Symmetry: D2
Subunit: 225 residues, 4 copies
Amino acid sequence: SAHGLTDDMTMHFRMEGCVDGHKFVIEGNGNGNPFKGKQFINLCVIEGGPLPFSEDILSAAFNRLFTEYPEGIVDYFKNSCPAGYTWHRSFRFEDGAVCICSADITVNVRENCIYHESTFYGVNFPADGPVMKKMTTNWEPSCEKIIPINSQKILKGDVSMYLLLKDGGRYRCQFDTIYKAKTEPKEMPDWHFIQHKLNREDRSDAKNQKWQLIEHAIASRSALP
Amino acid sequence: SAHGLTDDMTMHFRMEGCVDGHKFVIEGNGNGNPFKGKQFINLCVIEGGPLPFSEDILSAAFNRLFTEYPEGIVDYFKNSCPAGYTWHRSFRFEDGAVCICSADITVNVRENCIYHESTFYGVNFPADGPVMKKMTTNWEPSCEKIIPINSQKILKGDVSMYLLLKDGGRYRCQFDTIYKAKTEPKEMPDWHFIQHKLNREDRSDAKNQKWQLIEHAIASRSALP
Amino acid sequence: SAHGLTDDMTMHFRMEGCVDGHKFVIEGNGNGNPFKGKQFINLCVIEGGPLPFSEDILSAAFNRLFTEYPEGIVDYFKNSCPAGYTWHRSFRFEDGAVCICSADITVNVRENCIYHESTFYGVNFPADGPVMKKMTTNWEPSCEKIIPINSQKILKGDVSMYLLLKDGGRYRCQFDTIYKAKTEPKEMPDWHFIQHKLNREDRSDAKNQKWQLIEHAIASRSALP
Amino acid sequence: SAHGLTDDMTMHFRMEGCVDGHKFVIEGNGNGNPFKGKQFINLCVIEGGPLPFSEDILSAAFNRLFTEYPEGIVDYFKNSCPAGYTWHRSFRFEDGAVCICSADITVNVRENCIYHESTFYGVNFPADGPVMKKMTTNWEPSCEKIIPINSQKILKGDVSMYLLLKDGGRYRCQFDTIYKAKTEPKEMPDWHFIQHKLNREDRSDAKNQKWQLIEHAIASRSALP
């Protein structure tokens, strides 16, 4: 019950985006253990579906509160709760397309639920690219580098991502993020890693395009002594 | 009329955007001579003013119809009128900031007016960068290379841009644009260059943030025989 | 003489390099008119032949003296003669390959001959890429932007290059060059453009791998009034 | 005594490089446990010293044989011994400078020593940059991503590196590597991580510029279950 978070919370998701001119809105709700960096997100496309681009590109847009932080690493994110935090991210794929996303994370103590406001925009996905051809299956597990920006008291994210393709090829992407606490940080953490594992399961049917995302993230430092 | 265009038209502008969470809306109008690739733009911030980021980053979002093309190069843009055309672009600044914008151009023949609709999103402008410190003054005259992608009957733009700084420095940006006619083109151009000159003059008062833009662009091939 | 240069000179070339472990040495000569930015280059592989990678990637390594400059723009290069100048450049291809090259240009007044010495190193050209499959044909005419760095009295080059492919495709590369006079310049130019046209004609026989290059370059400012 | 490697070997180092025109040669010899991914390298600049650029940029040029591979991960490197392997790497620093390095690793069973042939080239380090001003202290610990290239049976390396600066700033760099076994690989490993820790200790004096590098590297997979 620290900072407004419990070992078993819920979340509500709302995302509005536009990719190469195609507008869309996504409604969702999930649950997870902010302390074990584990969450189950359930999303449904209410507007724009069926999406003309691969839904995998949106995955990383839907919450560092769900990160397991050991005692040795300051937890900037939970530290700024229940107020929440905001982040801004961009990424260019190896084929020129670039996307940017922003989200506002707010914790509602009364409901023991987290409210996620998501924004996503992308441009220039090649017509014959794996994204427009829906040939992606999952983001390969990664190791994100979290750097502290002292002067301004915020964090920077740097992670090389690979979107695995059905044809076995790898689609490289560079995540560059800025994490801002909605509350003046009293203590800034040192640099550290955050390994992630994000999986997508298509739950689509004749009526709706929907899917589930399971994210497992955990912080740490150099494995080397 | 020749594609519904004349040498003395007016324009209507409406942009909606968000840079690092700060929403804003801009409206404006103007006049120009498409045949001489010359245009005057008058903008006013009707929402989100005063903008916390330099207005210079938005400048290249406000119409290739205003490009003087020589008869030796196919004018993909004027050929798409009056229906018009759409475009998508990414801005990758040297300090990590990245922006993406899209627009829809349409010609209203009866009104001899061109309607311009756009969206602009940017992310990660450093707090002490030239953009947030409002040190930018104007984009530097450039030379964009236009490449044809015949398989999709669309065009690709490539131009390394430089924003001049008040201290005498410069700030680099990379423009990667995809241009696409609304109606299928029955003829495609070979690659070519487009030189531009874009100038901004701020005319903000106590009641509103406003400014004018002046663009001049000409299409050409290599200068070497 | 005007800086020891004349309108009908000869040149001497010697390049040493290594691309992905494959060493090679190239020698050659030529003639040209610096005042009209026009030159003819004859190269021959004397070591490492036949080159396993397309000879096109080396082409831009073989002299800004051959740039026709208008009196309205300071000719930083001719002003550095006869001592000459040195330059350093990086090539970042779209498939991950990166090359770096440097050269030292010197004018031998008595011999009316320019001595050109260079080194060229490249790395990671994919086995099935256009370079190793020898699919390249010629660089496309370009427009390089020259920027002055007054604090070090040196110049910076910026040009997005495209190598044309035999199947009708293109292969992008990014030229980032630093140019520096050997003797301190007593005058610096403003930024400007330099348009180029470089053509290769292979003339290899049973005994040697040889080819000729023809370059034409002119300096200018914006085409817009 | 597997593949020619023991739990306690030695190495000899020879590197020839050129940075922005400055030539240099480095002679060295080290020892380590290829099985615990631990090594102590001792280098001395015999030519070109004192180096005008920060010696930290050369660090990663001096042997994946020194990586601890658990039973669950195939060991491509030791697998190709005692023949050895070769690698090619490039990296662009956030300020434009780019370097490329290559090395040939050969194991000498009789001497129980590894011979390291190193090549390094860099260009365009800003005069007032942290590299030319010698303001760097160490490469921050990292997590490299090792990907297998099936078709060709080789490995690709991807690691975002940060060269820590005396003034506390971080100097970003992107390592892109290709690892090639000098012997047809019979078994290719799946993707995996290789965390590293490389430290530099200046052992320079009035006669020689010399220093020691301790590298500790260990392979693994997603920390997440």
